[PDB]
Symmetry: C5
Subunit: 112 residues, 5 copies
């Protein structure tokens, strides 16, 4: 029995147009394996910190890979970036806006 395999995917908004600091919305990983976050908006400065969160709400800095230059990091000071993360073994993920001047949007696509 041969089957053609495709992943499940969904979208999630962590921040829809943050203009002040916030932890934003937390994604429950469920059955997904990978996350790509897009950082967008018209800010002139910002800092986003990337976090894994467990069932008790403890936050742990989470490294991912920048799709522009393959750099590794657990935060960014830039906008117009995609960051890839391996999330399969995590309960929840969170993308904190530490600081922003203007507006920053943080949205993800998750893949099983």
């Amino acid at each position: 029995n041969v089957v053609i395999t495709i992943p499940d995917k969904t979208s999630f908004t962590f921040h829809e147009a943050a203009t002040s600091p916030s932890e934003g919305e937390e994604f429950v990983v469920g059955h997904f394996r990978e996350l790509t976050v897009k950082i967008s908006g018209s800010s002139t400065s910002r800092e986003i910190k990337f976090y894994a969160v467990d069932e008790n709400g403890e936050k742990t800095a989470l490294s991912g890979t920048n799709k522009t230059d393959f750099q590794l990091g657990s935060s960014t000071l830039n906008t117009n970036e995609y960051w890839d993360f391996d999330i399969a073994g995590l309960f929840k993920v969170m993308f904190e806006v530490v600081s922003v001047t203007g507006d920053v949007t943080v949205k993800g696509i998750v893949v099983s």
Copy 2:
């Protein structure tokens, strides 16, 4: 229950025989995970820039891997090359012909 698994694949033409600068056709990623782009044609010079595009049309430089030498890059000045990309968490991808003297074809095979 044991199943033999195979990927879904399709072909996509970004540029059929570009002779002038163009963003070309955008590929909506859908359920796919990986893309291999072939840059072909007959040219003296050409420049192809690789982009991810979000739902608002923002373009982000996208790095891939050259199958000939495993070099990383988000653009190329060469023809007769395959470039591999991880696209699973992206909305769309675009391969811009910034310039061509002669003609350049840009075609992909996508894999789930």
Copy 3:
């Protein structure tokens, strides 16, 4: 025949609030491929050693990847960390509390 594929996942507690040295509970890998361990609690100091265990009970130091900084290691002196392991070819895994001052929890999520 097209199928959407998702992994199996489960959770496992190696140590539910260790305050003295212990090997803790051993996880039978079964059909799983990957493990992510979270080291948590309010301990002021601890040492966790990571082990693969075979069917005869022989323990072998097992390296994994720290999700905060991508560092490799077979042990840690830190709390609030995730460690990723490729376990597909192992019979059992074990996370030994070698030492602790305070309480340390060791819990994993496994993925097929």
Copy 4:
């Protein structure tokens, strides 16, 4: 609904007992993802060049990984070697015997 997943595999002969230069047979990749080539025989010298080939017949040097030493390359002067390739995004692959003294066999196993 839980399924046990296994790949499709097949074998392909690029060269059965080449004693003079030849492009040999081309493999149409179809639904396969990976290729491992064995270079065998009693030749005393040879040069094999590894190619991806598109729908127009353009040949592109294709790097793979030597399973003995993890070296990368797009050709070999050696015999008794396995080379692994990621082929999922390619139309065809070809292994050219550029030169040979004696007999060289080039056979692959492909995996979905």
Copy 5:
């Protein structure tokens, strides 16, 4: 149509209690992708060489990754070690006991 995916696994004994030099038993890869070999026993010295074997019985040194320290190698002088191999494109694999004083067991778990 959504399915939860798990691998096929199997076990294989290359050597059950080798006390003198032997090539041991050959595993036919079949539909499997990844192999983890455990080297165990009470030997005080030993040398194990790792091989791929083709349909004609030709042996090729095969590199794998030590799970304790991520070191690469095609042989070992140590006991109490796991070695991981990518075997998907191989016909057969063999683990030769070149020498041993005492007993060495060589067993694998294989994953699709």
